[PDB]
Amino acid sequence: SDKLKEAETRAEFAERSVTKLEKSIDDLEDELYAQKLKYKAISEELDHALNDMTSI
Amino acid sequence: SDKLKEAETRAEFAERSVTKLEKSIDDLEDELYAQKLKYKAISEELDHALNDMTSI
Amino acid sequence: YLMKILTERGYSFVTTAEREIVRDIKEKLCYVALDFENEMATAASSSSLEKSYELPDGQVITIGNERFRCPETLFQPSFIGMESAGIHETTYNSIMKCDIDIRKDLYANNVLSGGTTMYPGIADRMQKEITALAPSTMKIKIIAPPERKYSVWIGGSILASLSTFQQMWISKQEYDEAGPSIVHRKCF
Amino acid sequence: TTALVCDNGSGLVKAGFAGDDAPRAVFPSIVGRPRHQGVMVGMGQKDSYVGDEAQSKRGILTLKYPIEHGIITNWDDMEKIWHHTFYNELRVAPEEHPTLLTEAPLNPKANREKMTQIMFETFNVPAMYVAIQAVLSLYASGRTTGIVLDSGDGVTHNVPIYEGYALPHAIMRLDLAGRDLTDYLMKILTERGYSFVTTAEREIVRDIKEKLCYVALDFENEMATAASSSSLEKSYELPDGQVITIGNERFRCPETLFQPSFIGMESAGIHETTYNSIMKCDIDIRKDLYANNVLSGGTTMYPGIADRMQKEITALAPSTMKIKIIAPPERKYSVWIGGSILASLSTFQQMWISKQEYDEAGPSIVHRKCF
Amino acid sequence: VPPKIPDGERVDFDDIHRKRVEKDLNELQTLIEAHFENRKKEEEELISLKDRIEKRRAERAEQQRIRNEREKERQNR
Ligand SMILES: Nc1ncnc2c1ncn2[C@@H]1O[C@H](COP(=O)(O)OP(=O)(O)O)[C@@H](O)[C@H]1O
Numbered sequence: 001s002d003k004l005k006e007a008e009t010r011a012e013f014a015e016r017s018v019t020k021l022e023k024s025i026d027d028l029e030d031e032l033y034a035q036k037l038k039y040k041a042i043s044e045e046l047d048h049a050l051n052d053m054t055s056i
Numbered sequence: 057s058d059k060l061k062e063a064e065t066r067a068e069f070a071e072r073s074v075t076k077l078e079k080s081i082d083d084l085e086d087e088l089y090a091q092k093l094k095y096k097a098i099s100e101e102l103d104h105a106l107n108d109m110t111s112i
Numbered sequence: 113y114l115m116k117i118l119t120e121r122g123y124s125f126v127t128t129a130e131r132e133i134v135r136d137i138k139e140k141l142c143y144v145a146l147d148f149e150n151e152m153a154t155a156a157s158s159s160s161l162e163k164s165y166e167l168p169d170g171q172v173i174t175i176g177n178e179r180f181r182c183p184e185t186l187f188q189p190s191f192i193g194m195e196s197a198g199i200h201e202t203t204y205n206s207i208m209k210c211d212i213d214i215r216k217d218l219y220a221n222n223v224l225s226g227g228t229t230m231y232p233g234i235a236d237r238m239q240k241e242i243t244a245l246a247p248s249t250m251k252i253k254i255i256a257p258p259e260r261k262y263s264v265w266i267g268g269s270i271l272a273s274l275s276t277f278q279q280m281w282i283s284k285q286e287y288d289e290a291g292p293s294i295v296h297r298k299c300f
Numbered sequence: 301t302t303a304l305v306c307d308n309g310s311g312l313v314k315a316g317f318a319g320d321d322a323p324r325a326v327f328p329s330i331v332g333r334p335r336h337q338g339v340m341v342g343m344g345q346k347d348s349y350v351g352d353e354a355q356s357k358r359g360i361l362t363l364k365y366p367i368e369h370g371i372i373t374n375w376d377d378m379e380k381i382w383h384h385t386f387y388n389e390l391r392v393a394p395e396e397h398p399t400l401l402t403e404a405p406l407n408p409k410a411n412r413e414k415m416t417q418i419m420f421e422t423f424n425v426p427a428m429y430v431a432i433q434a435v436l437s438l439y440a441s442g443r444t445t446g447i448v449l450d451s452g453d454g455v456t457h458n459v460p461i462y463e464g465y466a467l468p469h470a471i472m473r474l475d476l477a478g479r480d481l482t483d484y485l486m487k488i489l490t491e492r493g494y495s496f497v498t499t500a501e502r503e504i505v506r507d508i509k510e511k512l513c514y515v516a517l518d519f520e521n522e523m524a525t526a527a528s529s530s531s532l533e534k535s536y537e538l539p540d541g542q543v544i545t546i547g548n549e550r551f552r553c554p555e556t557l558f559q560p561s562f563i564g565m566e567s568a569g570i571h572e573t574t575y576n577s578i579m580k581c582d583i584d585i586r587k588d589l590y591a592n593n594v595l596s597g598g599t600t601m602y603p604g605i606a607d608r609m610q611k612e613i614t615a616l617a618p619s620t621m622k623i624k625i626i627a628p629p630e631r632k633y634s635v636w637i638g639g640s641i642l643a644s645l646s647t648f649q650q651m652w653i654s655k656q657e658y659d660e661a662g663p664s665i666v667h668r669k670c671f
Numbered sequence: 672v673p674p675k676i677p678d679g680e681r682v683d684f685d686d687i688h689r690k691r692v693e694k695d696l697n698e699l700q701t702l703i704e705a706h707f708e709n710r711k712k713e714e715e716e717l718i719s720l721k722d723r724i725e726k727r728r729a730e731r732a733e734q735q736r737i738r739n740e741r742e743k744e745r746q747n748r
Pocket residue numbers: 308309310311312313451452453454478479482506509510511597598599601602632
């Protein structure tokens with residue numbers, strides 16, 4: 001009884017923790033993608049500038 | 057005994073999930089931070105370019 | 113402190129034997145709150161926190177907001193009358209005394225050990241506190257291995273198993289020549 | 301075989317094989333012993349990290365430059381630096397390569413003699429030659445006349461040359477250079493609250509100086525503008541966060557070059573020692589020196605110095621002469637590029653100090669015909 | 672006495688062409704090539720990969736929602 005109470009309790013903590021972890025993971029990944037897309041927009045600004053520089 | 061076995065297995069699976077999620081989070085964090093530093097550097101060199109233009 | 117705040121519900125533990133029972137209660141039930149005021153407000157309205165526990169003779173007891181108030185003393189040592197700052201701020205002070213060029217590495221490699229750092233939810237509270245204190249650019253990471261309790265002993269085994277360390281022992285003939293004060297000498 | 305064009309410098313050691321465009325390995329010349337105790341066993345901790353390795357572990361080291369002002373004050377550390385340069389940054393044993401060191405003008409003899417003795421006894425090179433750091437910078441510009449102001453990090457010297465004939469009586473060597481500017485910047489930063497004291501934080505102040513400071517075209521107008529508006533305040537992020545904002549410290553640090561009274565030095569600025577160096581020359585080569593003023597060395601890389609110096613000299617000089625300031629974009633490595641060109645010449649191939657010659661006359665051979 | 676340099680033949684200021692004009696065009700063209708290839712390799716592939724990872728993330732979110740709901744349905748007692 002002690003063993004299974006312990007196991008279920010720590011398992012519930014594990015489930016809540018892992019779900020919080022998944023929210024964290026998604027937020028981090030989406031923020032990373034947003035930042036990377038901003039960077040690529042900046043890169044295409046630079047690439048338009050380079051196309052101008054094709055003047056040389 | 058049956059409940060104990062099932063609970064222990066569920067616990068171990070969730071635990072290994074937890075560890076793997078943490079590792080994934082760490083790696084994505086390293087890459088995102090590297091991108092962040094890259095962005096700050098590109099912006100700073102862009103501003104230096106702007107000030108160089110101001111000079112000449 | 114837990115034994116002292118349990119008296120607010122009626123349970124009195126006094127004997128030095130009952131300190132062990134209070135220790136078991138602390139180990140099995142207490143947890144560190146992510147945010148203290150919100151937990152204090154929630155435990156005072158709902159009853160989703162009250163977890164019960166069976167003494168060594170029956171007469172189950174119900175712990176209310178004593179659950180996260182006992183380990184909160186770590187981050188506010190004013191509860192037991194100690195002046196100093198919590199474990200969340202003595203780490204930041206210990207970092208700031210270091211040189212200016214190794215602070216990033218120390219920020220990124222904060223390690224937890226010892227038994228008392230096994231409270232469920234401490235590796236998040238401490239990270240939140242340090243992130244509040246530290247500059248916004250640095251990354252704060254808290255290493256909390258699952259084998260925290262025996263971390264010191266595992267490290268001791270690793271150190272004793274090294275070949276390079278095999279000549280650092282304080283050999284008995286050395287003690288016979290310099291007395292017990294040999295430990296402060298080169299053989300540290 | 302190929303020659304090794306080393307260039308000791310003071311602050312950055314630049315080396316590489318003769319005949320290329322840029323030095324192969326450029327790294328700070330600092331040797332830093334650890335200062336704390338050290339508890340991890342078997343970590344493989346060395347007793348002295350030199351070169352670019354000690355710019356990454358500088359948090360627990362005590363970096364100390366082995367070259368103070370051109371002269372070398374700590375011969376063991378300099379030997380260590382040379383050994384590192386030969387074996388780890390170039391990976392060529394010195395037993396099979398001539399070397400071409402460089403030396404500032406008007407330096408003590410014992411320094412040069414000890415340098416040649418080390419190169420011939422410890423590293424055992426086939427032949428080495430020591431050249432004045434300004435003639436090389438004149439080589440790199442492709443000129444043959446002109447007065448070159450080589451404001452390094454240790455010492456600023458101003459050697460005028462005409463038609464290949466150097467004028468030994470007109471060399472004006474001044475000991476204000478990049479290091480004193482770093483110290484003065486570190487001293488004026490304290491006026492806002494930022495205190496840098498450790499020898500490791502001198503590197504951080506050096507980085508601030510490199511990235512932010514600039515030379516003002518007119519000093520009083522800039523001092524007045526920075527005291528009213530806030531368009532100058534540029535911020536910078538320390539190695540741990542806590543960004544700092546530099547106000548009128550930006551153009552006050554490098555202004556010390558033109559007013560050495562700021563750091564208590566008596567002498568006149570680099571704008572007036574050049575004019576004095578010209579006026580000591582003969583009356584018929586002053587026009588050519590006016591028209592071919594050359595800048596070199598690291599410290600002359602401040603944004604806006606080639607205009608301030610021209611304005612100052614035009615103020616001093618007669619109104620008819622044309623004042624032109626040559627500021628190539630490859631200023632920092634100008635001395636080394638010139639060294640490579642000189643070592644690659646066929647006419648120069650018989651000027652090396654061959655080892656048998658050193659064996660016959662001792663280290664004092666360097667002052668002799670093989671200069 | 673000061674050293675006396677033996678007399679040679681030539682030259683000077685004639686290597687400025689052969690060390691300047693080279694990189695005046697080759698360096699510019701090579702750096703333009705490097706920028707073009709780096710942008711092509713980097714930006715489009717990164718945006719496409721981020722979109723792919725976003726789709727996988729949405730699928731993970733759906734799987735998490737389904738599992739959480741079914742477990743809450745069963746366990747609710
Ligand atoms: N881009 C830069 N802007 C301003 N100052 C610089 C820059 N680069 C280098 N310096 C200064 O010049 C010094 C390096 O000078 P350098 O020419 O390497 O000396 P040396 O003659 O000993 O080689 C550095 O200490 C730094 O203070």
